[PDB]
PDB file of C-alpha atoms (C1' of nucleotides) in Angstrom:
ATOM      1  CA  UNK A  10      72.414  54.794 -93.458  1.00  0.00           C
ATOM      2  CA  UNK A  11      70.852  52.374 -95.856  1.00  0.00           C
ATOM      3  CA  UNK A  12      69.453  55.361 -97.910  1.00  0.00           C
ATOM      4  CA  UNK A  13      72.472  56.975 -97.406  1.00  0.00           C
ATOM      5  CA  UNK A  14      74.485  54.398 -99.204  1.00  0.00           C
ATOM      6  CA  UNK A  15      71.693  53.080-102.026  1.00  0.00           C
ATOM      7  CA  UNK A  16      70.320  56.254-102.786  1.00  0.00           C
ATOM      8  CA  UNK A  17      71.972  56.803-106.033  1.00  0.00           C
ATOM      9  CA  UNK A  18      69.521  53.845-107.332  1.00  0.00           C
ATOM     10  CA  UNK A  19      65.419  54.276-107.148  1.00  0.00           C
ATOM     11  CA  UNK A  20      65.599  50.327-107.427  1.00  0.00           C
ATOM     12  CA  UNK A  21      66.801  49.986-103.882  1.00  0.00           C
ATOM     13  CA  UNK A  22      64.718  52.743-102.524  1.00  0.00           C
ATOM     14  CA  UNK A  23      62.126  50.879-103.631  1.00  0.00           C
ATOM     15  CA  UNK A  24      63.635  47.630-101.808  1.00  0.00           C
ATOM     16  CA  UNK A  25      63.276  49.606 -98.453  1.00  0.00           C
ATOM     17  CA  UNK A  26      60.052  50.932 -99.159  1.00  0.00           C
ATOM     18  CA  UNK A  27      58.425  47.607-100.231  1.00  0.00           C
ATOM     19  CA  UNK A  28      60.276  45.616 -96.708  1.00  0.00           C
ATOM     20  CA  UNK A  29      58.218  43.783 -94.621  1.00  0.00           C
ATOM     21  CA  UNK A  30      59.402  44.491 -91.362  1.00  0.00           C
ATOM     22  CA  UNK A  31      61.840  46.699 -89.558  1.00  0.00           C
ATOM     23  CA  UNK A  32      64.132  46.850 -86.537  1.00  0.00           C
ATOM     24  CA  UNK A  33      67.787  45.400 -85.591  1.00  0.00           C
ATOM     25  CA  UNK A  34      65.948  42.902 -84.016  1.00  0.00           C
ATOM     26  CA  UNK A  35      63.307  42.229 -85.686  1.00  0.00           C
ATOM     27  CA  UNK A  36      64.990  40.938 -89.186  1.00  0.00           C
ATOM     28  CA  UNK A  37      67.644  39.505 -87.490  1.00  0.00           C
ATOM     29  CA  UNK A  38      64.589  36.867 -85.913  1.00  0.00           C
ATOM     30  CA  UNK A  39      63.017  36.773 -89.487  1.00  0.00           C
ATOM     31  CA  UNK A  40      66.394  35.239 -90.722  1.00  0.00           C
ATOM     32  CA  UNK A  41      66.304  33.047 -87.781  1.00  0.00           C
ATOM     33  CA  UNK A  42      63.052  31.493 -88.482  1.00  0.00           C
ATOM     34  CA  UNK A  43      63.709  31.006 -92.277  1.00  0.00           C
ATOM     35  CA  UNK A  44      66.822  29.607 -91.914  1.00  0.00           C
ATOM     36  CA  UNK A  45      66.468  27.108 -88.652  1.00  0.00           C
ATOM     37  CA  UNK A  46      62.994  26.491 -88.361  1.00  0.00           C
ATOM     38  CA  UNK A  47      61.204  25.110 -85.406  1.00  0.00           C
ATOM     39  CA  UNK A  48      63.214  26.615 -82.841  1.00  0.00           C
ATOM     40  CA  UNK A  49      62.594  29.530 -79.985  1.00  0.00           C
ATOM     41  CA  UNK A  50      64.170  32.603 -81.541  1.00  0.00           C
ATOM     42  CA  UNK A  51      66.335  34.440 -79.349  1.00  0.00           C
ATOM     43  CA  UNK A  52      67.716  37.686 -80.319  1.00  0.00           C
ATOM     44  CA  UNK A  53      71.111  35.963 -79.318  1.00  0.00           C
ATOM     45  CA  UNK A  54      70.591  32.385 -80.847  1.00  0.00           C
ATOM     46  CA  UNK A  55      70.657  34.699 -84.271  1.00  0.00           C
ATOM     47  CA  UNK A  56      73.039  36.823 -83.229  1.00  0.00           C
ATOM     48  CA  UNK A  57      75.525  33.580 -82.920  1.00  0.00           C
ATOM     49  CA  UNK A  58      74.832  31.813 -85.712  1.00  0.00           C
TER      50      UNK A  58
ATOM     51  CA  UNK B  10      40.384  17.365 -62.193  1.00  0.00           C
ATOM     52  CA  UNK B  11      40.153  16.580 -65.791  1.00  0.00           C
ATOM     53  CA  UNK B  12      42.003  19.912 -66.699  1.00  0.00           C
ATOM     54  CA  UNK B  13      45.230  18.362 -64.315  1.00  0.00           C
ATOM     55  CA  UNK B  14      45.655  15.479 -66.810  1.00  0.00           C
ATOM     56  CA  UNK B  15      45.527  18.059 -69.803  1.00  0.00           C
ATOM     57  CA  UNK B  16      48.178  19.769 -68.151  1.00  0.00           C
ATOM     58  CA  UNK B  17      50.555  17.283 -68.905  1.00  0.00           C
ATOM     59  CA  UNK B  18      49.902  17.233 -72.842  1.00  0.00           C
ATOM     60  CA  UNK B  19      50.233  20.663 -72.483  1.00  0.00           C
ATOM     61  CA  UNK B  20      53.608  20.022 -71.022  1.00  0.00           C
ATOM     62  CA  UNK B  21      54.756  17.435 -73.686  1.00  0.00           C
ATOM     63  CA  UNK B  22      53.440  20.359 -76.042  1.00  0.00           C
ATOM     64  CA  UNK B  23      55.980  22.647 -74.148  1.00  0.00           C
ATOM     65  CA  UNK B  24      59.346  20.820 -73.957  1.00  0.00           C
ATOM     66  CA  UNK B  25      58.210  19.343 -77.967  1.00  0.00           C
ATOM     67  CA  UNK B  26      58.307  23.375 -78.923  1.00  0.00           C
ATOM     68  CA  UNK B  27      61.741  24.028 -77.697  1.00  0.00           C
ATOM     69  CA  UNK B  28      63.882  20.839 -77.967  1.00  0.00           C
ATOM     70  CA  UNK B  29      62.613  18.524 -80.628  1.00  0.00           C
ATOM     71  CA  UNK B  30      63.893  21.135 -83.941  1.00  0.00           C
ATOM     72  CA  UNK B  31      67.318  20.873 -81.874  1.00  0.00           C
ATOM     73  CA  UNK B  32      67.575  17.574 -80.873  1.00  0.00           C
ATOM     74  CA  UNK B  33      66.793  16.450 -84.598  1.00  0.00           C
ATOM     75  CA  UNK B  34      69.727  18.396 -85.714  1.00  0.00           C
ATOM     76  CA  UNK B  35      71.702  16.876 -83.154  1.00  0.00           C
ATOM     77  CA  UNK B  36      70.901  13.249 -84.160  1.00  0.00           C
ATOM     78  CA  UNK B  37      70.982  14.056 -87.868  1.00  0.00           C
ATOM     79  CA  UNK B  38      74.660  14.520 -87.602  1.00  0.00           C
ATOM     80  CA  UNK B  39      75.510  11.029 -85.543  1.00  0.00           C
ATOM     81  CA  UNK B  40      73.006   9.755 -88.145  1.00  0.00           C
ATOM     82  CA  UNK B  41      73.318  11.245 -91.023  1.00  0.00           C
ATOM     83  CA  UNK B  42      69.925   9.841 -92.051  1.00  0.00           C
ATOM     84  CA  UNK B  43      66.630  12.245 -91.358  1.00  0.00           C
ATOM     85  CA  UNK B  44      63.980   9.381 -91.250  1.00  0.00           C
ATOM     86  CA  UNK B  45      66.617   8.011 -88.441  1.00  0.00           C
ATOM     87  CA  UNK B  46      66.888  11.404 -86.832  1.00  0.00           C
ATOM     88  CA  UNK B  47      63.113  11.322 -86.550  1.00  0.00           C
ATOM     89  CA  UNK B  48      62.772   8.101 -84.977  1.00  0.00           C
ATOM     90  CA  UNK B  49      65.221   8.960 -82.170  1.00  0.00           C
ATOM     91  CA  UNK B  50      63.604  12.109 -81.472  1.00  0.00           C
ATOM     92  CA  UNK B  51      60.414  10.470 -80.822  1.00  0.00           C
ATOM     93  CA  UNK B  52      62.004   7.837 -78.824  1.00  0.00           C
ATOM     94  CA  UNK B  53      63.971  10.589 -77.127  1.00  0.00           C
ATOM     95  CA  UNK B  54      60.771  12.607 -75.934  1.00  0.00           C
ATOM     96  CA  UNK B  55      58.918   9.439 -75.244  1.00  0.00           C
ATOM     97  CA  UNK B  56      61.217   8.635 -72.505  1.00  0.00           C
ATOM     98  CA  UNK B  57      60.900  12.000 -71.270  1.00  0.00           C
ATOM     99  CA  UNK B  58      57.312  11.761 -71.034  1.00  0.00           C
ATOM    100  CA  UNK B  59      58.120   8.079 -68.731  1.00  0.00           C
ATOM    101  CA  UNK B  60      60.258  10.346 -66.520  1.00  0.00           C
ATOM    102  CA  UNK B  61      58.791  12.911 -64.422  1.00  0.00           C
ATOM    103  CA  UNK B  62      62.310  13.795 -62.734  1.00  0.00           C
ATOM    104  CA  UNK B  63      63.262  14.978 -65.384  1.00  0.00           C
ATOM    105  CA  UNK B  64      60.007  17.083 -66.426  1.00  0.00           C
ATOM    106  CA  UNK B  65      60.021  18.111 -63.213  1.00  0.00           C
ATOM    107  CA  UNK B  66      62.614  20.429 -62.433  1.00  0.00           C
ATOM    108  CA  UNK B  67      62.525  23.378 -64.644  1.00  0.00           C
ATOM    109  CA  UNK B  68      65.334  25.319 -62.807  1.00  0.00           C
ATOM    110  CA  UNK B  69      67.607  22.163 -64.230  1.00  0.00           C
ATOM    111  CA  UNK B  70      68.592  22.115 -68.065  1.00  0.00           C
ATOM    112  CA  UNK B  71      66.815  18.920 -69.348  1.00  0.00           C
ATOM    113  CA  UNK B  72      67.989  19.800 -73.234  1.00  0.00           C
ATOM    114  CA  UNK B  73      71.504  18.173 -71.745  1.00  0.00           C
ATOM    115  CA  UNK B  74      69.256  14.998 -70.576  1.00  0.00           C
ATOM    116  CA  UNK B  75      67.874  14.760 -73.887  1.00  0.00           C
ATOM    117  CA  UNK B  76      71.436  14.779 -75.732  1.00  0.00           C
ATOM    118  CA  UNK B  77      73.091  12.032 -73.672  1.00  0.00           C
ATOM    119  CA  UNK B  78      69.162   9.715 -74.074  1.00  0.00           C
ATOM    120  CA  UNK B  79      69.964  10.113 -78.124  1.00  0.00           C
ATOM    121  CA  UNK B  80      73.400  10.087 -78.079  1.00  0.00           C
ATOM    122  CA  UNK B  81      73.018   6.109 -76.241  1.00  0.00           C
ATOM    123  CA  UNK B  82      70.310   5.446 -78.726  1.00  0.00           C
ATOM    124  CA  UNK B  83      72.386   6.042 -81.486  1.00  0.00           C
ATOM    125  CA  UNK B  84      75.292   3.917 -80.601  1.00  0.00           C
ATOM    126  CA  UNK B  85      72.680   0.967 -79.554  1.00  0.00           C
ATOM    127  CA  UNK B  86      71.653   1.467 -83.317  1.00  0.00           C
ATOM    128  CA  UNK B  87      75.291   1.171 -84.453  1.00  0.00           C
ATOM    129  CA  UNK B  88      75.926  -2.722 -83.099  1.00  0.00           C
ATOM    130  CA  UNK B  89      75.386  -6.095 -84.878  1.00  0.00           C
ATOM    131  CA  UNK B  90      72.036  -5.698 -86.815  1.00  0.00           C
ATOM    132  CA  UNK B  91      73.374  -2.518 -88.674  1.00  0.00           C
ATOM    133  CA  UNK B  92      76.868  -4.523 -88.655  1.00  0.00           C
ATOM    134  CA  UNK B  93      75.864  -7.342 -91.215  1.00  0.00           C
ATOM    135  CA  UNK B  94      73.453  -5.504 -93.595  1.00  0.00           C
ATOM    136  CA  UNK B  95      73.980  -1.788 -93.814  1.00  0.00           C
TER     137      UNK B  95
ATOM    138  C1'  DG C  21      41.461  36.560-113.153  1.00  0.00           C
ATOM    139  C1'  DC C  22      46.740  36.090-114.438  1.00  0.00           C
ATOM    140  C1'  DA C  23      51.943  35.203-112.907  1.00  0.00           C
ATOM    141  C1'  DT C  24      53.934  31.445-110.174  1.00  0.00           C
ATOM    142  C1'  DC C  25      55.599  26.674-110.295  1.00  0.00           C
ATOM    143  C1'  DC C  26      55.153  21.875-110.349  1.00  0.00           C
ATOM    144  C1'  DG C  27      56.244  17.979-112.441  1.00  0.00           C
ATOM    145  C1'  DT C  28      57.031  15.678-117.205  1.00  0.00           C
ATOM    146  C1'  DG C  29      60.592  14.629-120.579  1.00  0.00           C
ATOM    147  C1'  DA C  30      65.454  14.549-123.025  1.00  0.00           C
ATOM    148  C1'  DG C  31      69.259   7.676-128.834  1.00  0.00           C
ATOM    149  C1'  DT C  32      70.183   2.473-129.359  1.00  0.00           C
ATOM    150  C1'  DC C  33      74.046  -1.147-128.567  1.00  0.00           C
ATOM    151  C1'  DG C  34      78.295  -2.833-126.240  1.00  0.00           C
ATOM    152  C1'  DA C  35      82.979  -3.629-122.997  1.00  0.00           C
ATOM    153  C1'  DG C  36      85.395  -3.540-118.910  1.00  0.00           C
ATOM    154  C1'  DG C  37      84.674  -1.849-113.030  1.00  0.00           C
TER     155       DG C  37
ATOM    156  C1'  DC D  29      71.018  -0.983 -67.794  1.00  0.00           C
ATOM    157  C1'  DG D  30      71.371   4.368 -67.230  1.00  0.00           C
ATOM    158  C1'  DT D  31      71.110   8.618 -68.991  1.00  0.00           C
ATOM    159  C1'  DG D  32      71.415  14.559 -67.296  1.00  0.00           C
ATOM    160  C1'  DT D  33      76.447  21.955 -66.788  1.00  0.00           C
ATOM    161  C1'  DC D  34      78.623  24.499 -73.730  1.00  0.00           C
ATOM    162  C1'  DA D  35      77.092  20.407 -76.628  1.00  0.00           C
ATOM    163  C1'  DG D  36      72.886  21.474 -83.167  1.00  0.00           C
ATOM    164  C1'  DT D  37      73.366  17.963 -91.986  1.00  0.00           C
ATOM    165  C1'  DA D  38      76.811  17.886 -95.715  1.00  0.00           C
ATOM    166  C1'  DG D  39      75.588  19.767 -99.714  1.00  0.00           C
ATOM    167  C1'  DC D  40      74.749  23.029-102.806  1.00  0.00           C
ATOM    168  C1'  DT D  41      72.218  25.540-108.826  1.00  0.00           C
ATOM    169  C1'  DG D  42      76.687  25.292-113.520  1.00  0.00           C
ATOM    170  C1'  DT D  43      70.217  21.284-117.532  1.00  0.00           C
ATOM    171  C1'  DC D  44      65.741  23.170-120.014  1.00  0.00           C
ATOM    172  C1'  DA D  45      61.727  23.114-122.937  1.00  0.00           C
ATOM    173  C1'  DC D  46      57.282  23.056-121.571  1.00  0.00           C
ATOM    174  C1'  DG D  47      52.443  22.635-120.420  1.00  0.00           C
ATOM    175  C1'  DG D  48      48.949  23.030-116.376  1.00  0.00           C
ATOM    176  C1'  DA D  49      47.688  22.880-111.901  1.00  0.00           C
ATOM    177  C1'  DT D  50      48.452  25.580-108.061  1.00  0.00           C
ATOM    178  C1'  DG D  51      48.047  29.969-105.547  1.00  0.00           C
ATOM    179  C1'  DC D  52      48.376  35.956-104.183  1.00  0.00           C
TER     180       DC D  52
ATOM    181  C1'   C E   9      83.515   5.269-113.356  1.00  0.00           C
ATOM    182  C1'   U E  10      86.112   4.748-118.455  1.00  0.00           C
ATOM    183  C1'   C E  11      85.453   3.503-123.893  1.00  0.00           C
ATOM    184  C1'   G E  12      83.806   1.340-128.703  1.00  0.00           C
ATOM    185  C1'   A E  13      80.049   2.145-133.003  1.00  0.00           C
TER     186        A E  13
END
DNA sequence: GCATCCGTGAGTCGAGG
DNA sequence: CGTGTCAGTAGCTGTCACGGATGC
RNA sequence: CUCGA
């Protein structure tokens, strides 16, 4: 669905390609460890904040 | 044996990795001084090590006992010595 | 081997708060 | 003194030129 | 904070 919405631009195709991690429960923990470091990252502790 | 004394050190390092960063945030709101929150965390986990009853039951939340020890430490700081000088 | 980022500097004097 | 169910900053970027150590 | 040259 991301390619469906931002497909008309090549700068967004290069963004999803150069991306490091993929997954709904993966980038949610990636945000958790950069926002609230030092804490155990749970799929629902990041879903909460 | 020597591994029994090292299992106690790996147990303290375990509760550090699950409660220290969350306890620092709690003391940070009650004091507003980050350098003071670090002092409350060290003193709270030091009393956890001195009380094996809190580290015994893992089925019981040790986090709640920490927030209460830190709360009582912060209000004691808020008495006479802070009153005049701060 | 080079783009990044850190740390440095940014008029003088005076009045009352 | 003892402490024990959720219990989680404010604030904020509306500076910039410039040089060189720091770093992928 | 605000003002004077």
